[PDB]
Amino acid sequence: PPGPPGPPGPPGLKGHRGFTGLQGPPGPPGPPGPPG
Amino acid sequence: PPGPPGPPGPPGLKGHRGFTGLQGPPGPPGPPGPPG
Amino acid sequence: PPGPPGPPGPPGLKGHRGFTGLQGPPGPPGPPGPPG
């Protein structure tokens, strides 16, 4: 009779790198200014 | 005759994590200073 | 004979989005205070 099914193929390719992260939030307000 | 072709291989590995996002903007200017 | 190897597996999934960026720095010192 015919032979058995062949073996599995190679593993798939690794996925592409993820999207770059979002930008972080703006920083806090600065310190109060110098005295007048 | 030869058996039929094998099945697809296993799925690929997941992609690498994306790069970390940009540092956030500087905060706004601080309050006016105290009176002279 | 056994069949030929199967085709490659499906691609891995896209990577995770990168981490969000750092919060930005504190803002600059505020303006000088009033004269009085």
Author numbering:
A (entry chain B), B (entry chain C), C (entry chain A): 1 to 36
Sentences from the study reporting this entry:
Collagens are an essential component of the extracellular matrix (ECM) of all higher organisms. All of them share as defining feature the so-called collagen triple helix; a structural element that is formed by three individual polypeptide chains (reviewed in1–3). The three-dimensional structure of this extended, non-globular domain requires a glycine in every third position, leading to a repetition of the triplet motif Gly-Xaa-Yaa. One of the important interaction partners of collagens in cartilage is the cartilage oligomeric matrix protein (COMP) a member of the thrombospondin family of proteins, also referred to as TSP-5.
Docking was performed with ClusPro and the best 10 models analysed by manual inspection. Furthermore, no metal ion would be necessary for this interaction. Asp594 and Asp595 interact with the lysine of the middle strand. To test this model, we mutated all three aspartates to alanine residues and expressed and purified the protein. To our surprise the mutant behaved similar to the wildtype in binding assays, falsifying the proposed model.
